[PDB]
Amino acid sequence: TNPYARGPNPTAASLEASAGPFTVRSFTVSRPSGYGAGTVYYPTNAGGTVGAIAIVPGYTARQSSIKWWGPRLASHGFVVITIDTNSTLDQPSSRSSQQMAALRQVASLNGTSSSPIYGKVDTARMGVMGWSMGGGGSLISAANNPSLKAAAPQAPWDSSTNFSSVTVPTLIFACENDSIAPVNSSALPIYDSMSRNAKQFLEINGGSHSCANSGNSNQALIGKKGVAWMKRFMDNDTRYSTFACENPNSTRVSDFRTANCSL
């Protein structure tokens, strides 16, 4: 009945594995428009069009810091573009503009017969992710585009902590011992500011600012939560309602909060 449901019914084991059911291919965007560079990850034979997610790194950082999300999310039924910004020193608002620019190019590549993702994307269903200033940029993207279906920034930082206008379902990955974007002055005030959406706050125990980046030691849990959140809210897939809204009840988590997220 749900036209957006893709893939086998999920289990904890399949969501915690390094890769999901779908085989992933990838290509580099030939002529990136409105951002620095892009890598597109997409699944082969997902059984239908899938949503698109754009992921942005942080200040001084590049695709490598966030690249692990590409294959992980794509293997579960998403088209994912990881970008480099025009300059590694771009601010959150500029990161948001380039993040949305990347999503627009994915939409155009969906209508380009020469592109590997031709006809593979439901361009009405998109999501935003990112690290640090790119997580702040994801929150700005969500606030400026309620058309988006989900957001999952990690260790976000922005000049402001007020994102009360966000109606997009938003999962915040936080890192307990973050000394660059401290939780008490960034992630948690941002989480508490949002009262008009489904939201979740997941703090990684003992995590530094890079606790959700490529190579991190919690990829099973973080990857499960990222995919589950995107499945529940970009696909409206109630098979993932428990995975997306549950307290993991794990010693890997030092703080868990959620609101408007029923199981």
mmCIF file of C-alpha atoms in Angstrom:
data_model
loop_
_atom_site.group_PDB
_atom_site.id
_atom_site.type_symbol
_atom_site.label_atom_id
_atom_site.label_comp_id
_atom_site.label_asym_id
_atom_site.label_seq_id
_atom_site.Cartn_x
_atom_site.Cartn_y
_atom_site.Cartn_z
ATOM 1 C CA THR A 1 0.000 0.000 0.000
ATOM 2 C CA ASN A 2 2.898 2.361 0.735
ATOM 3 C CA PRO A 3 4.277 3.316 -2.705
ATOM 4 C CA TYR A 4 7.624 4.483 -1.257
ATOM 5 C CA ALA A 5 8.504 1.280 0.617
ATOM 6 C CA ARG A 6 11.642 -0.362 -0.782
ATOM 7 C CA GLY A 7 13.757 -3.354 0.111
ATOM 8 C CA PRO A 8 13.409 -6.326 2.442
ATOM 9 C CA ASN A 9 11.758 -5.954 5.818
ATOM 10 C CA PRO A 10 14.397 -4.570 8.196
ATOM 11 C CA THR A 11 16.107 -6.284 11.096
ATOM 12 C CA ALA A 12 18.561 -4.897 13.624
ATOM 13 C CA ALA A 13 21.289 -7.050 12.067
ATOM 14 C CA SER A 14 20.683 -5.769 8.532
ATOM 15 C CA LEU A 15 20.548 -2.146 9.727
ATOM 16 C CA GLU A 16 23.735 -2.574 11.794
ATOM 17 C CA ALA A 17 25.796 -4.201 9.026
ATOM 18 C CA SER A 18 28.392 -2.261 7.048
ATOM 19 C CA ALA A 19 26.110 -2.401 3.996
ATOM 20 C CA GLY A 20 22.449 -3.109 3.359
ATOM 21 C CA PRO A 21 20.715 -5.269 0.758
ATOM 22 C CA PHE A 22 21.220 -3.171 -2.395
ATOM 23 C CA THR A 23 24.392 -3.085 -4.472
ATOM 24 C CA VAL A 24 25.870 0.418 -4.710
ATOM 25 C CA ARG A 25 27.535 2.137 -7.655
ATOM 26 C CA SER A 26 28.968 5.642 -7.719
ATOM 27 C CA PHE A 27 30.254 8.367 -10.017
ATOM 28 C CA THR A 28 31.847 11.800 -9.752
ATOM 29 C CA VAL A 29 29.679 14.690 -10.939
ATOM 30 C CA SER A 30 31.192 15.916 -14.201
ATOM 31 C CA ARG A 31 30.267 19.620 -14.010
ATOM 32 C CA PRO A 32 29.161 20.446 -10.449
ATOM 33 C CA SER A 33 26.808 23.436 -10.443
ATOM 34 C CA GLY A 34 26.722 25.674 -7.378
ATOM 35 C CA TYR A 35 29.206 23.698 -5.259
ATOM 36 C CA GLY A 36 32.783 22.458 -5.396
ATOM 37 C CA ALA A 37 32.600 18.751 -6.217
ATOM 38 C CA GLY A 38 30.235 15.834 -5.782
ATOM 39 C CA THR A 39 30.113 12.057 -5.565
ATOM 40 C CA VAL A 40 26.762 10.365 -6.227
ATOM 41 C CA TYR A 41 25.966 6.986 -4.661
ATOM 42 C CA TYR A 42 22.944 5.052 -5.903
ATOM 43 C CA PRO A 43 21.437 1.559 -5.589
ATOM 44 C CA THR A 44 21.009 -0.920 -8.422
ATOM 45 C CA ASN A 45 17.434 -2.181 -8.908
ATOM 46 C CA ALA A 46 15.836 -0.791 -5.754
ATOM 47 C CA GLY A 47 12.349 -1.616 -7.056
ATOM 48 C CA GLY A 48 11.265 1.973 -7.669
ATOM 49 C CA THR A 49 12.302 5.584 -7.479
ATOM 50 C CA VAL A 50 13.975 6.585 -4.217
ATOM 51 C CA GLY A 51 14.604 9.781 -2.306
ATOM 52 C CA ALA A 52 17.776 11.848 -2.497
ATOM 53 C CA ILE A 53 20.042 12.986 0.354
ATOM 54 C CA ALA A 54 22.743 15.679 0.175
ATOM 55 C CA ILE A 55 25.558 15.583 2.747
ATOM 56 C CA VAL A 56 27.997 18.433 3.462
ATOM 57 C CA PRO A 57 31.265 18.399 5.474
ATOM 58 C CA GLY A 58 32.461 20.981 7.985
ATOM 59 C CA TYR A 59 34.889 23.890 8.116
ATOM 60 C CA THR A 60 38.271 22.956 6.543
ATOM 61 C CA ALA A 61 36.898 19.470 5.748
ATOM 62 C CA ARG A 62 36.170 17.497 2.585
ATOM 63 C CA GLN A 63 34.066 14.553 1.380
ATOM 64 C CA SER A 64 36.270 12.007 3.172
ATOM 65 C CA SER A 65 34.945 13.122 6.568
ATOM 66 C CA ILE A 66 31.358 12.200 5.614
ATOM 67 C CA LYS A 67 31.906 9.749 2.748
ATOM 68 C CA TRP A 68 30.913 6.638 4.730
ATOM 69 C CA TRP A 69 27.262 7.763 4.707
ATOM 70 C CA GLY A 70 27.138 7.472 0.911
ATOM 71 C CA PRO A 71 27.457 3.704 0.494
ATOM 72 C CA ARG A 72 25.704 3.027 3.811
ATOM 73 C CA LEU A 73 22.538 4.956 2.944
ATOM 74 C CA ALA A 74 22.570 4.022 -0.754
ATOM 75 C CA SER A 75 22.700 0.301 0.070
ATOM 76 C CA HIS A 76 19.313 0.701 1.796
ATOM 77 C CA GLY A 77 17.557 2.547 -1.036
ATOM 78 C CA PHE A 78 18.624 6.177 -1.440
ATOM 79 C CA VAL A 79 20.520 8.326 -3.919
ATOM 80 C CA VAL A 80 23.209 10.162 -1.953
ATOM 81 C CA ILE A 81 25.423 13.048 -3.060
ATOM 82 C CA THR A 82 28.408 13.958 -0.888
ATOM 83 C CA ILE A 83 29.850 17.343 -1.770
ATOM 84 C CA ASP A 84 32.926 19.472 -1.399
ATOM 85 C CA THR A 85 32.156 23.145 -0.900
ATOM 86 C CA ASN A 86 33.488 25.872 -3.193
ATOM 87 C CA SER A 87 35.923 26.748 -0.400
ATOM 88 C CA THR A 88 36.642 24.705 2.711
ATOM 89 C CA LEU A 89 36.132 27.954 4.673
ATOM 90 C CA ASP A 90 32.504 28.505 3.610
ATOM 91 C CA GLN A 91 30.037 29.402 6.366
ATOM 92 C CA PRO A 92 26.851 27.475 7.288
ATOM 93 C CA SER A 93 24.545 29.680 5.199
ATOM 94 C CA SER A 94 26.779 29.192 2.154
ATOM 95 C CA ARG A 95 26.911 25.467 2.922
ATOM 96 C CA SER A 96 23.105 25.351 2.906
ATOM 97 C CA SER A 97 22.950 27.073 -0.492
ATOM 98 C CA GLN A 98 25.449 24.591 -1.940
ATOM 99 C CA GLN A 99 23.644 21.670 -0.284
ATOM 100 C CA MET A 100 20.364 22.617 -1.969
ATOM 101 C CA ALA A 101 22.248 23.283 -5.210
ATOM 102 C CA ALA A 102 23.547 19.707 -5.058
ATOM 103 C CA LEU A 103 20.013 18.355 -4.598
ATOM 104 C CA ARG A 104 18.877 20.375 -7.615
ATOM 105 C CA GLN A 105 21.640 18.838 -9.734
ATOM 106 C CA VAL A 106 20.585 15.366 -8.577
ATOM 107 C CA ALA A 107 17.056 16.255 -9.695
ATOM 108 C CA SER A 108 18.368 17.382 -13.084
ATOM 109 C CA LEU A 109 20.563 14.289 -13.422
ATOM 110 C CA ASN A 110 17.413 12.232 -12.832
ATOM 111 C CA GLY A 111 16.119 13.830 -16.036
ATOM 112 C CA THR A 112 19.365 13.325 -17.975
ATOM 113 C CA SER A 113 19.379 10.174 -20.109
ATOM 114 C CA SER A 114 23.190 9.927 -19.967
ATOM 115 C CA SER A 115 23.303 9.871 -16.153
ATOM 116 C CA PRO A 116 23.494 6.599 -14.192
ATOM 117 C CA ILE A 117 20.660 7.906 -11.979
ATOM 118 C CA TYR A 118 18.299 8.626 -14.902
ATOM 119 C CA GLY A 119 14.773 7.850 -13.733
ATOM 120 C CA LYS A 120 15.942 6.558 -10.340
ATOM 121 C CA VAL A 121 14.976 9.524 -8.124
ATOM 122 C CA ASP A 122 11.681 10.721 -6.685
ATOM 123 C CA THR A 123 12.701 14.381 -6.675
ATOM 124 C CA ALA A 124 9.721 15.274 -4.452
ATOM 125 C CA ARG A 125 11.377 13.499 -1.479
ATOM 126 C CA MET A 126 14.758 14.826 -0.339
ATOM 127 C CA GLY A 127 16.826 15.001 2.828
ATOM 128 C CA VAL A 128 19.827 16.854 4.217
ATOM 129 C CA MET A 129 22.757 15.729 6.373
ATOM 130 C CA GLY A 130 26.117 17.184 7.302
ATOM 131 C CA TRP A 131 28.868 17.652 9.858
ATOM 132 C CA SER A 132 29.621 20.704 12.035
ATOM 133 C CA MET A 133 29.157 23.803 9.825
ATOM 134 C CA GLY A 134 27.567 21.410 7.335
ATOM 135 C CA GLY A 135 25.193 20.257 10.049
ATOM 136 C CA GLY A 136 24.338 23.864 10.757
ATOM 137 C CA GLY A 137 23.827 24.289 7.028
ATOM 138 C CA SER A 138 21.486 21.294 7.028
ATOM 139 C CA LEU A 139 19.387 22.922 9.752
ATOM 140 C CA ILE A 140 19.299 26.137 7.707
ATOM 141 C CA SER A 141 18.258 24.117 4.652
ATOM 142 C CA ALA A 142 15.429 22.530 6.648
ATOM 143 C CA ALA A 143 14.258 25.894 8.002
ATOM 144 C CA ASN A 144 14.324 27.510 4.548
ATOM 145 C CA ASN A 145 12.790 24.515 2.705
ATOM 146 C CA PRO A 146 9.960 22.758 4.581
ATOM 147 C CA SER A 147 9.579 20.819 1.329
ATOM 148 C CA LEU A 148 12.381 18.568 2.604
ATOM 149 C CA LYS A 149 11.302 15.304 4.202
ATOM 150 C CA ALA A 150 14.073 14.610 6.738
ATOM 151 C CA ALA A 151 17.253 16.004 8.281
ATOM 152 C CA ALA A 152 20.023 14.244 10.233
ATOM 153 C CA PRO A 153 22.951 16.569 10.988
ATOM 154 C CA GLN A 154 25.875 15.500 13.161
ATOM 155 C CA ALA A 155 27.664 17.715 15.721
ATOM 156 C CA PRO A 156 25.954 20.764 14.191
ATOM 157 C CA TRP A 157 27.185 24.307 14.685
ATOM 158 C CA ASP A 158 25.783 27.658 13.610
ATOM 159 C CA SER A 159 25.952 31.234 14.861
ATOM 160 C CA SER A 160 22.334 30.867 16.004
ATOM 161 C CA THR A 161 20.811 28.038 18.024
ATOM 162 C CA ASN A 162 17.208 29.068 17.254
ATOM 163 C CA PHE A 163 15.644 26.726 14.689
ATOM 164 C CA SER A 164 12.122 26.868 16.118
ATOM 165 C CA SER A 165 10.544 27.249 12.663
ATOM 166 C CA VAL A 166 11.752 23.826 11.464
ATOM 167 C CA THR A 167 8.901 21.456 10.600
ATOM 168 C CA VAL A 168 11.159 18.872 8.920
ATOM 169 C CA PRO A 169 11.724 15.689 10.999
ATOM 170 C CA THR A 170 15.195 16.248 12.442
ATOM 171 C CA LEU A 171 17.585 13.764 14.059
ATOM 172 C CA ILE A 172 20.583 15.398 15.750
ATOM 173 C CA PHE A 173 23.705 13.318 16.266
ATOM 174 C CA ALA A 174 25.714 14.819 19.123
ATOM 175 C CA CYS A 175 29.130 13.964 20.556
ATOM 176 C CA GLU A 176 29.348 14.028 24.347
ATOM 177 C CA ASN A 177 32.834 15.510 24.791
ATOM 178 C CA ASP A 178 32.670 17.854 21.773
ATOM 179 C CA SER A 179 35.043 20.763 22.406
ATOM 180 C CA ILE A 180 34.558 22.447 19.005
ATOM 181 C CA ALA A 181 30.746 22.643 18.918
ATOM 182 C CA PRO A 182 29.982 21.899 22.579
ATOM 183 C CA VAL A 183 26.659 20.160 23.144
ATOM 184 C CA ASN A 184 25.534 22.604 25.840
ATOM 185 C CA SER A 185 25.948 25.599 23.496
ATOM 186 C CA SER A 186 25.096 23.966 20.151
ATOM 187 C CA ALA A 187 23.378 20.610 19.624
ATOM 188 C CA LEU A 188 21.200 20.611 22.746
ATOM 189 C CA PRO A 189 20.016 24.257 22.456
ATOM 190 C CA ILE A 190 19.255 23.545 18.789
ATOM 191 C CA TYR A 191 17.286 20.425 19.724
ATOM 192 C CA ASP A 192 15.358 22.254 22.454
ATOM 193 C CA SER A 193 14.490 25.091 20.063
ATOM 194 C CA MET A 194 12.401 22.847 17.770
ATOM 195 C CA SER A 195 8.804 22.377 18.948
ATOM 196 C CA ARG A 196 7.040 22.041 15.564
ATOM 197 C CA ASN A 197 8.430 18.723 14.303
ATOM 198 C CA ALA A 198 9.325 15.140 15.007
ATOM 199 C CA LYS A 199 12.810 15.272 16.486
ATOM 200 C CA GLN A 200 15.457 13.117 18.126
ATOM 201 C CA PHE A 201 18.645 13.860 20.071
ATOM 202 C CA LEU A 202 21.259 11.082 20.174
ATOM 203 C CA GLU A 203 24.460 11.882 22.070
ATOM 204 C CA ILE A 204 27.401 9.520 21.533
ATOM 205 C CA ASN A 205 29.125 8.583 24.792
ATOM 206 C CA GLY A 206 32.655 9.970 25.016
ATOM 207 C CA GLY A 207 32.510 11.231 21.439
ATOM 208 C CA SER A 208 34.746 13.971 20.095
ATOM 209 C CA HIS A 209 33.620 16.439 17.422
ATOM 210 C CA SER A 210 34.251 13.805 14.713
ATOM 211 C CA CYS A 211 32.302 11.018 16.446
ATOM 212 C CA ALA A 212 29.920 10.434 13.505
ATOM 213 C CA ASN A 213 32.512 10.792 10.728
ATOM 214 C CA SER A 214 34.048 8.178 8.450
ATOM 215 C CA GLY A 215 36.014 5.604 10.423
ATOM 216 C CA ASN A 216 34.132 6.163 13.679
ATOM 217 C CA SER A 217 33.742 3.354 16.206
ATOM 218 C CA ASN A 218 29.913 3.419 16.376
ATOM 219 C CA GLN A 219 28.978 2.855 12.729
ATOM 220 C CA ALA A 220 26.590 0.003 13.567
ATOM 221 C CA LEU A 221 24.403 2.178 15.799
ATOM 222 C CA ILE A 222 24.848 5.508 13.995
ATOM 223 C CA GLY A 223 24.303 3.877 10.608
ATOM 224 C CA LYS A 224 21.185 2.086 11.844
ATOM 225 C CA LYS A 225 19.709 5.302 13.244
ATOM 226 C CA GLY A 226 20.536 7.338 10.139
ATOM 227 C CA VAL A 227 18.943 4.842 7.752
ATOM 228 C CA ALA A 228 15.948 4.243 10.030
ATOM 229 C CA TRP A 229 15.237 7.972 10.341
ATOM 230 C CA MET A 230 15.481 8.549 6.589
ATOM 231 C CA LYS A 231 13.319 5.490 5.902
ATOM 232 C CA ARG A 232 10.641 6.497 8.408
ATOM 233 C CA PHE A 233 10.290 10.093 7.234
ATOM 234 C CA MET A 234 11.455 10.252 3.614
ATOM 235 C CA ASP A 235 9.640 7.005 2.721
ATOM 236 C CA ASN A 236 6.850 7.263 5.347
ATOM 237 C CA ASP A 237 7.865 3.648 6.032
ATOM 238 C CA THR A 238 6.236 2.533 9.287
ATOM 239 C CA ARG A 239 8.325 -0.655 9.233
ATOM 240 C CA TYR A 240 11.066 1.655 10.548
ATOM 241 C CA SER A 241 8.932 3.481 13.135
ATOM 242 C CA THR A 242 10.426 1.510 16.029
ATOM 243 C CA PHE A 243 14.022 1.692 14.780
ATOM 244 C CA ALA A 244 13.713 5.446 14.202
ATOM 245 C CA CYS A 245 11.969 6.446 17.447
ATOM 246 C CA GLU A 246 13.316 3.966 20.014
ATOM 247 C CA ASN A 247 15.835 4.595 22.742
ATOM 248 C CA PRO A 248 18.768 2.354 21.717
ATOM 249 C CA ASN A 249 19.313 1.541 25.423
ATOM 250 C CA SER A 250 23.031 1.267 24.693
ATOM 251 C CA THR A 251 26.119 2.152 26.709
ATOM 252 C CA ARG A 252 27.351 3.810 23.495
ATOM 253 C CA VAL A 253 24.773 6.581 24.099
ATOM 254 C CA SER A 254 25.208 9.127 26.898
ATOM 255 C CA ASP A 255 21.970 11.042 26.227
ATOM 256 C CA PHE A 256 18.844 10.155 24.246
ATOM 257 C CA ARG A 257 15.800 12.383 23.750
ATOM 258 C CA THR A 258 12.918 12.323 21.286
ATOM 259 C CA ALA A 259 9.601 14.067 20.703
ATOM 260 C CA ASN A 260 6.638 13.498 18.366
ATOM 261 C CA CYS A 261 8.169 10.114 17.445
ATOM 262 C CA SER A 262 5.698 7.313 18.176
ATOM 263 C CA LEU A 263 6.626 3.638 17.925
#
